[PDB]
Amino acid sequence: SMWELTILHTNDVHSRLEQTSEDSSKCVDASRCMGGVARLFTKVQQIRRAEPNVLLLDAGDQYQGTIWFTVYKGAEVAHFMNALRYDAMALGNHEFDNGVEGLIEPLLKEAKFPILSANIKAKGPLASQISGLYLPYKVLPVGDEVVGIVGYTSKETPFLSNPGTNLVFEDEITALQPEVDKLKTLNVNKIIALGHSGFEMDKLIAQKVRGVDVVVGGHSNTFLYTGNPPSKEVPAGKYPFIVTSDDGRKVPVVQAYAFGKYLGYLKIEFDERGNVISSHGNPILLNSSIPEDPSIKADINKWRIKLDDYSTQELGKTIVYLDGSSQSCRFRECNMGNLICDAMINNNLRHTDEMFWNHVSMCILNGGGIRSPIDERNDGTITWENLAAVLPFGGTFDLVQLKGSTLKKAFEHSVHRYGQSTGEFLQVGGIHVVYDLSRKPGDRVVKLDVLCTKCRVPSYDPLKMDEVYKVILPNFLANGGDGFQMIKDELLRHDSGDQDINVVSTYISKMKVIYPAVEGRIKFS
Amino acid sequence: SMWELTILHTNDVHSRLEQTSEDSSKCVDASRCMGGVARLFTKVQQIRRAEPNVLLLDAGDQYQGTIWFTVYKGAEVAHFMNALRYDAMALGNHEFDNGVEGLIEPLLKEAKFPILSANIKAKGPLASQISGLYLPYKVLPVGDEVVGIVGYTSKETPFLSNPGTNLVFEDEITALQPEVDKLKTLNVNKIIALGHSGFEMDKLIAQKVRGVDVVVGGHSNTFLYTGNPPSKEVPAGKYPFIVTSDDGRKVPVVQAYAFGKYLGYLKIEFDERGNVISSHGNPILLNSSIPEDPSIKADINKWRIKLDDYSTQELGKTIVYLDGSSQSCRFRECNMGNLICDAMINNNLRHTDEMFWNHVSMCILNGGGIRSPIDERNDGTITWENLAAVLPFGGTFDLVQLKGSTLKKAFEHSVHRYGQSTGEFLQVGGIHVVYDLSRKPGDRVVKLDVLCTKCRVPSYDPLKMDEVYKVILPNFLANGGDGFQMIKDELLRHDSGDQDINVVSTYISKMKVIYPAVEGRIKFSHH
Ligand SMILES: O=P(O)(O)[C@@](CO)(Cc1nn[nH]n1)OC[C@H]1O[C@@H](n2ncc3c(NC4CCCC4)nc(Cl)nc32)[C@H](O)[C@@H]1O
Ligand SMILES: O=P(O)(O)[C@@](CO)(Cc1nn[nH]n1)OC[C@H]1O[C@@H](n2ncc3c(NC4CCCC4)nc(Cl)nc32)[C@H](O)[C@@H]1O
Ligand SMILES: *[C@@H]1O[C@H](CO)[C@@H](O)[C@H](O)[C@H]1NC(C)=O
Ligand SMILES: *[C@@H]1O[C@H](CO)[C@@H](O)[C@H](O)[C@H]1NC(C)=O
Ligand SMILES: [Ca+2]
Ligand SMILES: [Ca+2]
Ligand SMILES: [Zn+2]
Ligand SMILES: [Zn+2]
Ligand SMILES: [Zn+2]
Ligand SMILES: [Zn+2]
């Protein structure tokens, strides 16, 4: 005898409540738009009506990405996930972006489903405050069986978000194994690991955590597919990805890209003792072939009324595609990066009253801070809402004095673990860098020319290690985010800047028509 | 017996009536300013009081370069050259910039000294109109002797200016020799060739034209000096430069850079039969050590009143030196070029109602069209006057559809005679070009990448020969100037654009603070 479970799964939805363009920017041409919570609900109900044993799971990073989260601050997440009737969610890194209070009062108190993390431990006054609002696991009834779901969250969360110093983020394998053993002693024979640490960590969990039957992941924005993929996303492996564990077991690992563009869909056949005997499926592309549910869409429109103040005024026009996609901006020079760096540099030079920074022409910008493209095909209109999708974090473009050796160390860090879509890869202004990736990590920077400052005509001269340079960058990077510890430690001055999104809107308002290009600021050898 | 003559000479003054900064841009810090007509007058008078036999000569290109010429149109040239008591002038190419009417009514009718060119022949109805207003030669009394001065003008004048199709520009050597022979039969044994064809042609004249004793030149902006030079300009040779002629004679050739920064000064010792026994001198740096003459300065201030409309409004600010010097912009990437090209591109995109050119991101700009720097040390203010020194010509930034093969032929022409400070060297926008100069002319372009247009994100892709590109450029280049004959002939569309100086002021007004760099748009390689 066999027992079939259908796992429906989203991850890194990142406040894409409404349907989006193919690239996850704002919907303009409705006939070609994709995803959003109303469309997901239609596909979820289609599966639920057909399959008797169904779990709808989220692997974190619902928080942050559009004006939805800027305005509603997680109430939209609670509300629409409840309307969809998610069975469980794992805490991601972006769930702590508005502090622990930003997690508790909107999401944890209003969610009608369990929220999960087994490697986040609470200490101090916070322990009693957050007791039971999230859990290490939940044991869910599914038909006449039970399925254990055990949660996890990235160890990098303190370095990427605002979880506060009373939350300790343990190792995933060390925290998960006792919980999985606890569930076995409670006669839960089917166990799903649901969490938010990336596809590599998901694979290690599948391997090393004995008793885990399936890993549903997130954080790396990984697309897995078996067969011919339905859109632009290139699959990193088959769906599901099969790990061979330490005790010889085949453990399926899944992820469902990002932005609610796909619904992950895995059918698993279990024996009577909760061993996986087979698995199959694929992520389902939520395109115009699936209608947005009328009820959920009507509710979305009601919540949408408050947001329409942010889409009113045209700040300017683009006549080129502003490529702010992760696949470009984390792997090579992207023109959205160039735009943002040029805006950073240009805005700073209006502050003529402050003479220490009035010649700053160099810029560094973490690629992962660029959160969305903007489309050029609607007479390429750029509103505030469009900008808020690119720059949702409410950071500042701060000013730092750095030694040359600090700067070379940062450019080595930029490509130290290249090829995994991590956000540390640097977009630049007033810098020409050339990488050779065949060299070992810490020695991949082969050419590095920067704009001179003690010179009448600015030209790109080679960077000297002993020389000091002035750079404009996100406060995230100045304070040591993305493992840029050399910046925070070794910087000589650090001034607070202007607000990031205001800098870019000012710049676009000034220029009227923008046309940034890929110029060979970042080259490969 | 011996007879000593002192030749004082200017060339390519280019409307620098007032004193200038070291680089020839507007005077701001008066304590370190140079040249101008008031200072020149002081130095000329010092020499005249000291030496009995003095000629003050001009080798052309007084016309064009600042608002002085924009407003007064050659009347300031006539007026201040007359006040200085120039003995003779040769017609340069820029003397024809406002047509033949622009030469006649201001300069030729009001000048109290002879104006000279022996290789400009007038035909049609214009011949009788301009007969004798300029001359092939003039024979000037100097003390008890006479000195013949014979004129010449660049054969490239029709391709650089607006002389009209009724003026023919003959070969200089063929035109000069009969005049020099004629003067020998008229018992003129001392002959100066004064003209405007460049230092190379000056040397050929010295060599080939039998009877010429001295060549006073212009057009190439050549600095010659003997000893340690007093300023930024690198000497091309000794002063005077000595040609050994075909008929066995040492002929001194002189020039005096440009912009009235130096007064050329050559002492020649002649024998009784008008042969040069020796020559010596140097150009005199007209710096703060020579005071401005009170009379000429007071007259300059009176004429200056009408011009002060052009310097009131600050259009914007630069925080970098805008290198618009000939030594940069005709030899490599200069940031003034980059600025002008970016302004050309940016202004064009405001015309959204016209959909054929609304994605144009490629620009070519002849380096010789960039006429002056702008300084950054006075809180680097940019007025209209400053801009008018960079872009004096009143051209337009026109729009052309060109084949790729046309564009590569233009980039080959850009460096075909590289190393001579000729204006055809191209400043660019949305183009990355790499030259190898060790290769032969017509095959020096080794890499040539341009911004794509049928593409969502613009990147620099290699230029395809069969593919067609849209480019913004000066109408000078579209109409075939600087020997860019491939553009005029092989272009597919040609629309008139906006006025050149208005494009750059609009852009500066928009940007407020400008900081253009040398970016590697133009590189050189030795493979
Ligand atoms: O799953 P994700 O979203 O975690 C992901 C994982 O690699 C993947 C992804 N790809 N596409 N969408 N998602 O990207 C993370 C990258 O994003 C950048 N990052 N994160 C936060 C943040 C920040 N501010 C903080 C401080 C106050 C709360 C927010 N500020 C700036 Cl400038 N960058 C920021 C960084 O590069 C990091 O490596
Ligand atoms: O002695 P010069 O001054 O002749 C000189 C000789 O090599 C030397 C020089 N160096 N520094 N100052 N002088 O430069 C010539 C270069 O100047 C450029 N040039 N000339 C005219 C002109 C023009 N318009 C004209 C057309 C109708 C009347 C106005 N338009 C644009 Cl865009 N360029 C123009 C061109 O490159 C040429 O090669
Ligand atoms: C939607 O996706 C399916 C595959 O999942 C594909 O066959 C279909 O062509 C798509 N429909 C559109 C774009 O309307
Ligand atoms: C002016 O030029 C003379 C002659 O070359 C030189 O000796 C002197 O130093 C200069 N005076 C200045 C810069 O004040
Ligand atoms: Ca099991
Ligand atoms: Ca003689
Ligand atoms: Zn995420
Ligand atoms: Zn994440
Ligand atoms: Zn000239
Ligand atoms: Zn000339």
Curated annotation (Swiss-Prot), chain B:
Gene Ontology molecular function, alphabetical: 5'-deoxynucleotidase activity; 5'-nucleotidase activity; GMP 5'-nucleotidase activity; identical protein binding; IMP 5'-nucleotidase activity; nucleotide binding; thymidylate 5'-phosphatase activity; zinc ion binding
Subcellular location: Cell membrane
InterPro entries: 5'-Nucleotdase_C (IPR008334), 5'-Nucleotdase_C_sf (IPR036907), 5'-Nucleotdase_CS (IPR006146), 5_nucleotidase/apyrase (IPR006179), Calcineurin-like_PHP_ApaH (IPR004843), Metallo-depent_PP-like (IPR029052)
Disulphides: C27-C33, C329-C334, C341-C363, C452-C455
Organism: Homo sapiens
Predominant location category: membrane
Full protein name: 5'-nucleotidase
Keyword presence, Lyase: no
Disease per record: Calcification of joints and arteries: A condition characterized by adult-onset calcification of the lower extremity arteries, including the iliac, femoral and tibial arteries, and hand and foot capsule joints. Age of onset has been reported as early as the second decade of life, usually involving intense joint pain or calcification in the hands.
Highest taxon listed in the record's lineage: Eukaryota
PROSITE patterns noted in UniProt: 5_NUCLEOTIDASE_1 (PS00785), 5_NUCLEOTIDASE_2 (PS00786)
Residues the entry annotates as binding Zn(2+) 2: D12, D61, N93, H196, H219
Gene Ontology terms describing biological process: adenosine biosynthetic process; ADP catabolic process; AMP catabolic process; ATP metabolic process; calcium ion homeostasis; DNA metabolic process; inhibition of non-skeletal tissue mineralization; leukocyte cell-cell adhesion
EC number: 3.1.3.35, 3.1.3.5, 3.1.3.89, 3.1.3.91
Covalent lipid adducts (GPI-anchor amidated serine), residues: S525
Family recorded in the similarity comment: Belongs to the 5'-nucleotidase family.
Residues holding Zn(2+) 1: D12, H14, D61
Positions of AMP binding: R330, N366, R371, F393, F476, D482
Oligomeric form and interacting partners: Homodimer.
GO CC list: cell surface; cytosol; external side of plasma membrane; extracellular exosome; membrane; nucleoplasm; plasma membrane
Site for Transition state stabilizer, residues: H94, D97
Cofactor(s) it depends on: Zn(2+)
Bilayer topology annotation: Lipid-anchor; GPI-anchor
Cited function: Catalyzes the hydrolysis of nucleotide monophosphates, releasing inorganic phosphate and the corresponding nucleoside, with AMP being the preferred substrate. Shows a preference for ribonucleotide monophosphates over their equivalent deoxyribose forms. Other substrates include IMP, UMP, GMP, CMP, dAMP, dCMP, dTMP, NAD and NMN.
Alphabetical keyword list: Cell membrane, Disease variant, Disulfide bond, Glycoprotein, GPI-anchor, Hydrolase, Lipoprotein, Membrane, Metal-binding, Nucleotide-binding, Signal, Zinc
Catalytic activity as recorded in UniProt: a ribonucleoside 5'-phosphate + H2O = a ribonucleoside + phosphate; a 2'-deoxyribonucleoside 5'-phosphate + H2O = a 2'-deoxyribonucleoside + phosphate; dTMP + H2O = thymidine + phosphate; CMP + H2O = cytidine + phosphate
Residues that carry a glycan: D29, N287, D309, D379
